Design a binder for this molecule. Sequence first.
Ligand SMILES: Nc1ncnc2c1ncn2[C@@H]1O[C@H](COP(=O)(O)OP(=O)(O)O)[C@@H](O)[C@H]1O
Ligand SMILES: [Mg+2]
Lengths: 371, 49
Amino acid sequence: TTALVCDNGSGLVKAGFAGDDAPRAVFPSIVGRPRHQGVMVGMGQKDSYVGDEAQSKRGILTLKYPIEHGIITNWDDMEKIWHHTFYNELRVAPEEHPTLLTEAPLNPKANREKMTQIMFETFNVPAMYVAIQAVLSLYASGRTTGIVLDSGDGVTHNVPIYEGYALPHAIMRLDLAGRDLTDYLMKILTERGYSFVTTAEREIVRDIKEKLCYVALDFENEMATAASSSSLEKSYELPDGQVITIGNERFRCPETLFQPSFIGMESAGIHETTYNSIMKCDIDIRKDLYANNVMSGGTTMYPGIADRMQKEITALAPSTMKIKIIAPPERKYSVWIGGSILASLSTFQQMWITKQEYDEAGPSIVHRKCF
Amino acid sequence: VPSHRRVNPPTLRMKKLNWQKLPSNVAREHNSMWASLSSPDAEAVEPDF
Ligand SMILES: Nc1ncnc2c1ncn2[C@@H]1O[C@H](COP(=O)(O)OP(=O)(O)O)[C@@H](O)[C@H]1O
Ligand SMILES: [Mg+2]
C-alpha cells in the first residue's frame, strides 16, 4: 500500500505518492469566489474555485488564503482544499491509503484536534501522521541533527534538533515570510507608479518576486551600484501585455528577511533568530548546529541567500569553529521528500495512528503520540 | 436519578463529538446545574437516536 505525502503549507499544497522523489500535485492554496454578476446561464459556473482553476481564472475572483501565518483560520476553505487535493489531483480514495501531513511548530492543540477530526471523520483514512516540517526537512537532508530555518509563506521558524530530539524551548517563530515580502513589494512598486491593490494582482507580484528577486550579498554596495548605474534593472511582462522594469526592488524586497524594520517590526533578522536559537541550546551541541544550517521553504529560493546567510552567522557566531550552510537545490520540496522518506519505512508501520486508536482515544492521541 | 446516563447501545459506529469531560463529584455539587438536572422532576427531553 502506497502512502500519500501532502504538505499543506501556507503557500502551496505539495502532494503525491510515497516512495517517490517529486510531488505530483503542486498547487497554490487559494479559494476563489466571484465578486461580479453572472449573466451566462449554464456551463458549470461553480461558486468557489479552488487551486489551479482559481489561479487561471483569477481576474474575476476574490482569492482567500485558508492558512494565514501557519494557522488554519478558515476551515471550510481548508476542507475544500483537501477535497480538491484528494479527489481531483491525486484521484485516490482516502479510505485505502495512508496520508502523511505536516504542521508548523508551537501550534495550538485544538488545531491538531480539528485536523485529526477532519482526517478521521470526513476524509476517513486507514492511518495518518502529523509531523513537524523542520524534522522532515532534516530527514530529507539525510542528517539526524542540525538546525532548520524553515521560511514558508507566513512563518519563518527556527528549530534545532539534536540526534532526533527536537529541542522545544529553543524553537522560535518570526512572522515574516513570503506574503509579507509580496505586500512590501506592492508597497514599494507604487514609487515607480505601478499600482497593485487587488488580490488577483498579488499573484502577479508574487510571480515577479519568484522570477526576479534575489538576496543581496551586501546591501549598501547594492544601493551604491543601483544608484550609480542602471545595469541591474530587469524587465517583466504583465499578463495584459504591459512591460514594467524594476531596479533595486529585486533586492530591497528580500532584505526584509534581514531587516524587519522596513515593514516596522522591532525584531531583528533571521540571522539573529538563528543565533538566539543557538544560545538556547547546550554548549556541547552548538558546534554541530553551526555546520548544519539547513534551510527549507520556497522563501529560501532566492539565489544569493546562502552566502549572505553564512556571512551573517559568521559575523554573529565566534569564528573559532566552522560555519556551514546546508542549502540543497530541492529544499523547496524537502518537506515532501522527508515525508516520502518517513512514510515507506519498516519501523514506521508501528508509529501509524489507526482508526482503533482514534475511536479509543478521541482526536487527542496525536498529542501523546507525536512530539 | 441517572436519567441522562440510561442510554441504549446503538448497533452502528458513530462520529465522536469532542469536548472536555467534567468530573462526577464536581458536577454533582449542590449548587451546580447538573445535580438539578439529575432530579427526576426535571423536564427530560428524549432525543431521536
Ligand atoms: N522560485 C522562487 N523564488 C522565490 N520565492 C519563491 C519561489 N518559489 C516559491 N517561492 C515562495 O515561497 C513559498 C513556497 O511555498 P512553500 O514554502 O512550499 O509552502 P508554504 O509557504 O505555503 O508553507 C511561496 O509562497 C512563494 O511565495
Ligand atoms: Mg510550506
